[PDB]
Design a protein around this ligand. Sequence first.
Ligand SMILES: Cc1n[nH]c(C)c1S(=O)(=O)N(C)C
Ligand SMILES: Cc1n[nH]c(C)c1S(=O)(=O)N(C)C
Ligand SMILES: [Cl-]
Ligand SMILES: [Mg+2]
Ligand SMILES: [Mg+2]
Ligand SMILES: [Mg+2]
Ligand SMILES: [Mg+2]
Lengths: 194, 194
Amino acid sequence: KQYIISEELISEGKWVKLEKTTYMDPTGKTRTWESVKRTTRKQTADGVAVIPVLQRTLHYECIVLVKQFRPPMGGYCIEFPAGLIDDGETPEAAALRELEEETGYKGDIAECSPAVCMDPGLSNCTIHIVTVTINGDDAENARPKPKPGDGEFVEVISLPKNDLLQRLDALVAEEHLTVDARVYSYALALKHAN
Amino acid sequence: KQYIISEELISEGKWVKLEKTTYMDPTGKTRTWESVKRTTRKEQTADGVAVIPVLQRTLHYECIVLVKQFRPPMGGYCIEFPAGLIDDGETPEAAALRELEEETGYKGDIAECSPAVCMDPGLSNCTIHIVTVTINGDDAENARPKPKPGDGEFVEVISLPKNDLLQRLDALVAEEHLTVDARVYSYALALKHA
Ligand SMILES: Cc1n[nH]c(C)c1S(=O)(=O)N(C)C
Ligand SMILES: Cc1n[nH]c(C)c1S(=O)(=O)N(C)C
Ligand SMILES: [Cl-]
Ligand SMILES: [Mg+2]
Ligand SMILES: [Mg+2]
Ligand SMILES: [Mg+2]
Ligand SMILES: [Mg+2]
């Protein structure tokens, strides 16, 4: 019933563009929408986000997260490790690479989502969500070496999977941080399950 | 360590604006970043709410109530938690209950309400509260629930069993072109991982 008729560039930055989208509503009335897109896409998706499950024997299983200054938020956020997929990179390879660069950990692919939307009322942005295990007892993960690109500044925070939501709430309460909505959603379902 | 220096408008639409943000990096160097914001954000704790609606009925498995809509930024249909913008002066809880009834017909009961969480913090300042709501599906109010779509709103309801949510989302995606929302997929993945 619904579909795009045309797009009009409103403004294109180096990294972000703002469009005016004309679409057919399901009555047959024509309507307009203000949409954002990244100018970086080729790609299955703009990005990957990594769910990293740190497995060490005789310890709680942890989910490995990153804290970083996010200029659009004007603040520090807590997020899954994540970045854009390089032209001609697979989502899985992007994941293992972003995970290493942001956390120093070397992990294994457990599963990989289709392209999922970030904020579909605003943007066309999409990611692959990639579940990765990290064998924390392996020598390559003993003193994980985080190799960040130019200008990345990333603090690693590992939290126990079985208390993740309470742990995230405490961080928010003490530290004036913003937790990411995917992180929060995953943490909520951990509590809601069964 | 890091902070915003200045935010310079690049282009303002009716609903979204694009800004050059100038910030202090943790080396002491000035850097820039293009950032998206809503135009309308007033005194709300966030732009929006998304509702995790747990439909409970005697001798049924619990369902998660989801919505399917055309999303002009995506150019296609998306499957999401029911969601909408917080009206000026409205509480996240009232906005969540209202949006759930408008989009699905159900009348829910508040269970919990998250802090403001970021939607895509590398891109925008957008935030929501994630509000968990239980729906008493045995109540007559919720028997033949009629959606009250707003002007230009056109929503289908999809209720999927909590205990098989991810497999049921995969089956929907395998059957048509649509995109699952990243917070929905994250929630479904955590229900599997727990
Ligand atoms: C109408 C429209 N265009 N772009 C967006 C975003 C929207 S909106 O209804 O979601 N809104 C005012 C934030
Ligand atoms: C550096 C920058 N600023 N704003 C954005 C968005 C970016 S980006 O190049 O990282 N990108 C397209 C995701
Ligand atoms: Cl796992
Ligand atoms: Mg990153
Ligand atoms: Mg990186
Ligand atoms: Mg909505
Ligand atoms: Mg609505």
